[model samples]
Target: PNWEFARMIKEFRVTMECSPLTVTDPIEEHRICVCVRKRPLNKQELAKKEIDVISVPSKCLLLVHEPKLKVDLTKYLENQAFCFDFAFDETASNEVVYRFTARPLVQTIFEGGKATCFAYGQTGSGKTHTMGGDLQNASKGIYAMASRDVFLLKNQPRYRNLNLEVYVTFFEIYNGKVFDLLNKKAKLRVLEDSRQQVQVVGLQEYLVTCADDVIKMINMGSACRTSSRSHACFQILLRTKGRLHGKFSLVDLAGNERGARQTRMEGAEINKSLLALKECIRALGQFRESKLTQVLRDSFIGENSRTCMIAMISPGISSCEYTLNTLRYADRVKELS
Candidate 1:
């Protein structure tokens, strides 16, 4: 639909009728929690006079007021509502996001469990912002917050005697291949041993004694994997006496936009990975279909594992299509038991 026609429909001031969730009520955690986060429109969208089309009436509800046009030039507002484990409006802070999504994973790790929190959205939808903020201000974002919290738990007297140590591994998946970000982008092998444990052979993992060490390694690994079509994973492994005790992974998925690519090969690879990722979650046995999932197998299929998906979206009217796609993806994940 044209912007002028969409503007005409906007004058109707169409709204959805729903009640907000009580703030005092807590959100119960799921093995796979799917969250939808709507970011505020940026300067460019504001400059274009794009209106906000997404609404979160409750903690678990999201509504999309999509503008539509008929063959006779009639304009109308089409409302679509979806439910999720957590629906965060534009005003919600990153700290608040981490609390519900990844914060508890720290305790899960302490109990010798695997955990993963990943951001899924289209390009420029703030996935990077949600997963890992500016390297200069490394104290923010989910990865930074998780790292700090992991060390905080490790320093506690109760956990200190457990002899927990943190190891950091950063890697990227591009063109169906995995590369070690902490090792000068060296190619790695994804192997599943007889015990069914997924291992990234040749991956360089560095001992991180404190949160600062993780931040530093993240900054360096980030510089090594700058491709937009690639998926980056940052892992914090908890070990005791050199044995893997637990692990928390933060995966920043490649943007879910096919139109953002220049080459068909690149688009195909990204599409395959994203599709395989969704299918693996839906069925839970197709991890070998993509390198991304092969590396994330443990996080997806362990009895003591937890996974959270943060489906980031923009509130701008122009990007309504992309926003809807992300919401639907998140909804499917929410449907998973």
Candidate 2:
């Protein structure tokens, strides 16, 4: 790729212009809601003189102006368009993102529906920030916002009589093994019961009351992980009379940059599990391929479940390929019936 030529064309303001026919809100939430969240270019990217090649004409439409080289070494701009359940540009806040992606799931949980929200993208692309922000600052992350909403809904007049209990579980899958982040990084097992329900053997769950407790648990578990070379799942469960009523599973997927052998091996495994998840959603039947998917069985197999996938991406031209791959992956998720 001719970086010089590409930069020249970009400086000349050569691009395929795109516009929306009508501005509109996202589609009504469904069982599977796929969305994209593009982060603004960071200082490092800007230092490298990278430009933004993506644009959002509406809340649901995204366009990518891909830089290409012709046979004569000339530069051309290729425009690609994608639509999803929702699309949030860099200017959008986490609050609004939560409202569109995870807020509805709160209501679904209160109604005894299983829900899962996943943050998928390359490394350092804002997935972790979106899922679990600075634990010290309680107002910055989706997990915190969700906990606050859950507590509020629990105290509402209708649900108050049920005497609901909130339980939180945090764990990670690394190197094809599961560890309980709340239990001194203890190894855990995945099993299926007589009813074919997936279970995590010996996983420790903390009883949480307020958002503070949830943040503390997150802080505790996050402290346990010295590295981010794994997939982490934080579960918020609602129980009444010792029976499971609802579950909210938040998955922060591993870095998806498959470009480096150990890192590449890890990426292969991660991609395998991710593919399993997609196929499970597409088939809507089985999820026995990976431990991650096994634990998420309830979120996809039943009619009373809802899943939201937020594809995080960076806006810099440096991440153009990664962004497009992320968007296409998300588009596939939304394409299913």
Give me the runs in candidate 2 sitting further than 4 Å from their true place. 1-29, 134-138, 259-264, 284-288
The residue pairs that clash in candidate 1, if any, are: none
lDDT of all the models against the reference? 0.80, 0.80
Model 1 lDDT tens row, 29-78? 34666678998888889999999999988777788999999889999999
Clashing pairs in 2: none
Poorest 10 consecutive residues of model 2 by lDDT?
Answer: 14-23
Rate residue 309 of model 2 by lDDT. Answer: 90
Residues 255-316, candidate 2: write the lDDT tens digits: 76664445347767787788888887776422438778887888788767778899988888
Clashes of each: 0, 0
